């Protein structure tokens, strides 16, 4: 809170809870997260549309450059590939799932829209996919099918949002529901921006930035931004130079990841904005990873693109960890950016 | 069927080995006191619930301790290092949520993670603290005990998933036996034992004080009736009945008792299966070596994924266990050495 | 049943990625032209066959390129070194006969062998030449394309063995669909795509030019219903129907289209099975990402021993694929996103 | 401070497990007899020193056995083969001098060496004999016991190096407690136990005979506060106080006792640290399982290089241990279950 002390709510807890707990595996975002996004953003924009692959495009009209801001609403999960004779389920990953995060875990097996049954992940006696299975308490293939399970059924971890200490949280899918949360807050806080703004909750980031590619083509923005998580490996046993970002040290301004080298004018501009407005920030370089920005910048004849990231520990698990001060800083910098973008010269 | 709300109370109370007084002890006392003549807590914390009767003196032990973790060190940036309480596998700790018990009835959340299969030196817990001092201000100390954040849920028509079915499913079982039992020709001591998971310690001391004529343990046993397990290595099958223990690594159950239990199960059409473990150990291993020897048997609830936050059990096997134990207590006056 | 003579023509025409104009292109044009309003060949060599109709614009893609080899070097004693075109496994080249394409409709035989498990540095082709000069005299150059010496044959009552069922079985399919289709409420573009095996390249460019409302790919999918494969890893079974693609590594098919395809199959009693690939990739991976997005589905022909001179397919699955695609096109005007 | 000459007597007396009667037993009796009402030696050789008082009966155990070697074989050229008594690491035996005990109060020197990391089959002792017969003439037999040739010396301002600080530092501690203690409201049994190093055997049998209301062990604990040890694995630090044992592999100390000891140390400003061992074992592991159970705690002297001829201890931690144990005995009458 420490400038000339400011009072901030920092994160709207009930709203964050809504967004992290709606199911929305890649390709199947329509099952939960889509409608949560539409309901929570529609009042703050002039127009909401969902496009052909299911991207939610929320348009706030203004006189200025066309700006796209993308936050992916898909989460990683599992799909049922086979139902064994004794009712056990075999699975394939949707997105980059590590088998070791599935062992002795509870799951929500989505048998219909707004309907799940519990499952337990286990391995055949380190584990790879051939060894992983899900127990739903069925005794036979017939019983599992009776229960609503089919080849193609989608599954997420059973995770809920909880507080960790004074400023931190644990949850499923902070990647990238924390950014979906962020653009919802930007949408509320943005007023009279000299910018033609397109908030996009993208589909299928986790399987290759697919939703960002097609929505960016449709929108044809002058400038693009992604908001995603980035690695915070500020944990025991990590060399300082490999920590990438630190929790609570601010919003992360992306210099580059494996999918994008952010436009250096935009990188410099965002840093100077953060400095001017005393918003906590840190500079982000990812040796791997990839974000929607990787697709946006390559749209048509090219789009100058930047990115802000929320540092997150334990990415791609049921127990991702984020710091509310970094989330606050991200909302603020993005807001300031959109209010100042009519001045940006490239 | 099972009494779902009772089962929930029993599995969700905290009570790691040595620290059972922090939750589970009071649940057992509260739930059993009305069905027995006397309840006592002994020097190591065993709950000894006595139902007077005319017949042989019988001890039935269900261990109330669960496996868990203890804080060994608080790192400079507020992360916790831990030691196992009981047989914990590190691979069950990664990307899991925990309840970090800062007082009786008070917890904060924690997250399990590893340093870049994992061994103990690579395991740590994140509680959202920024420094050692902050962790300490939040109430964490060397010796703080920790359990998984687990809750009871239903799986399909007859099954359940929970933390600590090992051995709260047996604690639940003896509560039901106590409720059901009336005018048995037996002098019955129901014992919720402490510190089974660190070497059958509470059973040893309680059995000594009680000096029973006959002993029984109720515990989980391995159900490895899961994909990729050879049939001969499945041990028990969920839904195929209560498991009558022939032997485990800690006890060869008295063959007269084993046969008598099987004949009772056959005579009352109680579903059962015969259990042999090549490893493991149960309170029966302490009971039978009490003083000059105690003829001892054991019943087990088949359980999948033992020693994890996601243990799985079948209500039909639980009911069969309650039923067979009740019939055993009702008929033990007729058993001869 | 299948039109065996038509199948034979399509599988035996050469058409390695980037060099489809050497054989398969003209076969496709010759065999489809009478059943559509217009056939064009585009800049990269895709064959686009257009059947005008009143309804949504639909692209159906079957790749006409096959995997093969290209000559990288002619050794002093006349042996050839090669590079793969598409995903070629070197172990499928050993002690095999090849057709070394020296011109359009002209070849010399070759023999694959390894230098005393094999990688590419060990593979060479023997064409019976004694020197580099003799090899060149025979028409071989750096860049010369090579296919297996393969032919279509029958296996038992319903099955076939052939070179390039991937993806000539789908080229065969769209030819049959073109013949069957009448008065459809759809503007239809059958596309024999180039260079799928090197990264879905022709599908990308042809899809951009067509700008379809809906997209479909027809390709082979893994049938690993063979000895030693766990049931859960078999993917599809031969003779159990056309495979409706849910996802592969290149596409998650639109769920509305997946459901609609399944309901059509049920309605018309067409045999089907649901396909999930953990790897792979098909033209659908390029089509759905065209411009602002294209809702896309796929049907697959189950095939054993994919990417070899002995790929195996079931006529019943091929018939089911023809029938379902036809029903799809006749019914797509009713489909709503 | 410590009483240096007393400490020297205690660490330098021979007394390997089972053979404590050869030196250490008589030292303990001589040094304690004047400060207690009665001293008795029991059937396995435990020294039981009883100070009568009005209050709870308290057993305090410090093990007088040290690790060592026993002669298994005399080779043709006079070399000795050995078996370990207690947890001896062979790498602590190479290029070391030994006292080979040929009678009570009589020794000859020996030298440890290995055959060309080393295991037991490679270890031998050279006593300067030329033949088996000469070794035998010198008094060596199968069963001869052997200790390192170690003596107490000072290291810097507050530290010491010695053979057998494990557990002669605790033997020294109970002698000082006995000297200091006067008119305590407690019925005190100081026990110098036998055969701790081979499985807590003397503590088990003495605790049974005594039947105490409360038990305490005093032993060394790991101080790995040395170069290259991660902070979370140091366990205790020399000079940072007496270690209050929360748990080791043999005992989870009674939490009421653990907390009470910490509060006493805080109330009297006695430096202390909290101890958790993931392995190890102490007499407390036998004491608490006596009969119907005995609430038990433990204090430890941090020690570096445990189980060697060069164990290291800090006098400030020793003094704190004496002080806390004295305050515990003086205040135990107030402790409630
Ligand atoms: Zn991700
Ligand atoms: Zn992401
Ligand atoms: Zn257990
Ligand atoms: Zn158990
Ligand atoms: Zn193909
Ligand atoms: Zn292919
Ligand atoms: Zn020792
Ligand atoms: Zn010791």
Swiss-Prot record, chains B, C, D:
<feature type="binding site">
    <location>
        <position position="197"/>
    </location>
    <ligand>
        <name>Zn(2+) 2</name>
    </ligand>
</feature>
<feature type="active site" description="Proton acceptor">
    <location>
        <position position="196"/>
    </location>
</feature>
<protein>
    <recommendedName>
        <fullName>Tetrahedral aminopeptidase</fullName>
        <ecNumber>3.4.11.-</ecNumber>
    </recommendedName>
</protein>
<dbReference type="GO" id="GO:0046872">
    <property type="term" value="F:metal ion binding"/>
</dbReference>
<comment type="function">
    <text>Functions as an aminopeptidase, with a clear preference for leucine as the N-terminal amino acid. However, can also cleave moderately long polypeptide substrates of various compositions in a fairly unspecific manner. Has neither carboxypeptidase nor endoproteolytic activities, and it is devoid of N-terminal deblocking activity. Is involved in protein degradation, performing degradation of oligopeptides produced by the proteasome into single amino acids.</text>
</comment>
<feature type="binding site">
    <location>
        <position position="166"/>
    </location>
    <ligand>
        <name>Zn(2+) 1</name>
    </ligand>
</feature>
<dbReference type="GO" id="GO:0008237">
    <property type="term" value="F:metallopeptidase activity"/>
</dbReference>
<feature type="binding site">
    <location>
        <position position="63"/>
    </location>
    <ligand>
        <name>Zn(2+) 1</name>
    </ligand>
</feature>
<feature type="binding site">
    <location>
        <position position="307"/>
    </location>
    <ligand>
        <name>Zn(2+) 2</name>
    </ligand>
</feature>
<keyword id="KW-0378">Hydrolase</keyword>
<comment type="subunit">
    <text>Homododecamer. The assembly of six dimers results in a tetrahedral-shaped structure; all 12 active sites are located on the inside of the tetrahedron. Substrate access is granted by four pores with a maximal diameter of 18 Angstroms, allowing only small peptides and unfolded proteins access to the active site. Beside the four entry ports, TET contains 12 small product release openings, which are large enough to allow passage of only single amino acid residues.</text>
</comment>
<dbReference type="InterPro" id="IPR008007">
    <property type="entry name" value="Peptidase_M42"/>
</dbReference>
<keyword id="KW-0170">Cobalt</keyword>
<dbReference type="InterPro" id="IPR023367">
    <property type="entry name" value="Peptidase_M42_dom2"/>
</dbReference>
<keyword id="KW-0479">Metal-binding</keyword>
<dbReference type="Pfam" id="PF05343">
    <property type="entry name" value="Peptidase_M42"/>
</dbReference>
<feature type="binding site">
    <location>
        <position position="219"/>
    </location>
    <ligand>
        <name>Zn(2+) 1</name>
    </ligand>
</feature>
<feature type="binding site">
    <location>
        <position position="166"/>
    </location>
    <ligand>
        <name>Zn(2+) 2</name>
    </ligand>
</feature>
<keyword id="KW-0862">Zinc</keyword>
<dbReference type="GO" id="GO:0006508">
    <property type="term" value="P:proteolysis"/>
</dbReference>
<comment type="similarity">
    <text>Belongs to the peptidase M42 family.</text>
</comment>
<dbReference type="GO" id="GO:0004177">
    <property type="term" value="F:aminopeptidase activity"/>
</dbReference>
<keyword id="KW-0645">Protease</keyword>
<keyword id="KW-0482">Metalloprotease</keyword>
<dbReference type="InterPro" id="IPR051464">
    <property type="entry name" value="Peptidase_M42_aminopept"/>
</dbReference>
<keyword id="KW-0031">Aminopeptidase</keyword>
């Amino acid at each position: 809170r420490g400038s000339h002390m400011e009072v901030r709510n920092m994160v709207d807890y009930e709203l964050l809870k809504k967004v992290v707990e709606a199911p929305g595996v890649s390709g199947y975002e329509f099952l939960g997260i889509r409608d949560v996004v539409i309901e929570e953003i529609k009042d703050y924009v002039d127009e909401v549309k969902v496009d052909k692959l299911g991207n939610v495009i929320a348009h706030k009209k203004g006189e200025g450059p066309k700006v796209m801001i993308a936050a992916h609403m898909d989460q990683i999960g599992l799909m049922v590939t086979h139902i064994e004779k004794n009712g056990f389920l075999r699975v394939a990953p949707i997105g980059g799932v590590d088998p070791k995060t599935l062992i002795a875990q509870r799951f929500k097996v989505w048998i219909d829209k707004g309907k799940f049954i519990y499952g337990v992940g286990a391995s055949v006696p380190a584990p790879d996919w051939d060894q992983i299975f899900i127990d739903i308490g069925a005794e036979s293939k017939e019983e599992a099918e009776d229960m609503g399970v089919k080849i193609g059924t989608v599954i997420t971890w059973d995770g809920r949002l909880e507080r960790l200490g004074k400023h931190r949280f644990v949850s499923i899918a902070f990647d990238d529901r924390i950014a979906v949360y962020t653009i919802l807050e930007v949408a509320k806080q943005l007023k009279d921006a000299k910018a033609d703004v397109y908030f996009v909750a993208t589909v299928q980031e986790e399987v290759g930035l697919r939703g960002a590619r097609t929505s960016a083509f449709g929108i044809e923005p002058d400038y693009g931004f992604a908001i995603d998580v980035t690695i915070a490996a500020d944990i025991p046993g990590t060399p300082e130079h490999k920590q990438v970002t630190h929790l609570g040290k601010g919003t992360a301004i992306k210099i580059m990841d494996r999918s994008v080298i952010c436009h250096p004018t935009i990188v410099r501009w965002l840093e100077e904005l953060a400095k001017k407005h005393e918003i906590p920030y840190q500079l982000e370089i990812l040796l791997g990873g990839g974000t929607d920005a990787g697709a946006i910048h390559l749209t048509k004849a090219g789009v100058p693109t930047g990115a802000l990231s929320v540092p997150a520990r334990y990415i791609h698990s049921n127990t991702e960890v984020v710091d509310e001060r970094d989330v606050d800083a991200t909302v603020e910098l993005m807001t300031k950016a959109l209010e100042n973008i009519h001045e940006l010269k490239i």
